[PDB]
Amino acid sequence: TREGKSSEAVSQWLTAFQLQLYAPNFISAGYDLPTISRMTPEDLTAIGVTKPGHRKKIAAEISGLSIPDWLPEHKPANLAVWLSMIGLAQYYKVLVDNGYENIDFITDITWEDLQEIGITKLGHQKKLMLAVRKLAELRRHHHHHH
């Protein structure tokens, strides 16, 4: 019921500004509030939010979301631990079987790479990619701390 608690929370959020009609769009794509807080308008369009007034309303509400930090702030010890912190433990096997078996390799993965190997849910793709860019920034700053 983590996924159940999460989806209830996505519905209650939408309901409070009367756009609960998109609940299935977000939930079927595996969006949770944390990932939703980082959506762009194109991400809304990709889940079927195409009417400009709805898309702009949602965009305005997302900018107002205040939710606690959830991205890890360090390069974790391994893939398993990293997936577990971000709530995506279920993709471990498919990631490993496809050649993304350690944190270093996962840092270079792209949206297109996910699509190819069967991680097709847009919300999960978004969350993975937000986490991956956090890793890439850590890696990019690592030798530049003086």
Side-chain angles (χ1 to χ4, degrees):
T1 337
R2 314 207 174 291
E3 213 166 29
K5 279 173 198 187
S6 163
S7 69
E8 180 57 42
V10 174
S11 304
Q12 294 182 131
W13 174 67
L14 288 168
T15 293
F17 52 92
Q18 292 94 52
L19 286 177
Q20 63 275 23
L21 67 96
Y22 294 107
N25 297 245
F26 284 93
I27 292 165
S28 67
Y31 272 103
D32 52 6
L33 281 172
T35 309
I36 287 178
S37 79
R38 299 277 258 112
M39 286 179 89
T40 65
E42 285 75 34
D43 287 324
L44 293 159
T45 294
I47 59 157
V49 187
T50 54
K51 291 173 175 180
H54 297 172
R55 186 176 42 246
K56 272 165 194 153
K57 219 312 181 39
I58 295 190
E61 289 289 344
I62 285 156
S63 72
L65 258 190
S66 212
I67 72 86
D69 295 352
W70 55 272
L71 289 162
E73 286 280 359
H74 64 279
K75 180 190 190 203
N78 62 66
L79 212 232
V81 185
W82 177 71
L83 290 174
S84 182
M85 290 165 187
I86 58 172
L88 297 173
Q90 71 222 66
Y91 297 115
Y92 179 72
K93 182 92 169 145
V94 92
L95 282 169
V96 166
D97 288 354
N98 279 112
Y100 297 103
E101 61 278 323
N102 67 64
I103 286 290
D104 296 326
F105 297 173
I106 208 50
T107 305
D108 291 315
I109 204 168
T110 62
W111 189 88
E112 293 73 21
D113 301 325
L114 293 179
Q115 188 68 19
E116 290 188 355
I117 69 191
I119 308 177
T120 52
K121 283 189 202 187
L122 289 174
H124 288 176
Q125 282 175 324
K126 186 72 181 182
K127 201 187 201 175
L128 274 164
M129 285 306 127
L130 289 166
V132 168
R133 290 178 197 118
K134 175 61 169 199
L135 293 171
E137 176 187 79
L138 292 177
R139 181 234 257 157
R140 191 192 321 121
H141 299 170
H142 181 82
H143 295 105
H144 309 293
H145 295 292
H146 329 276

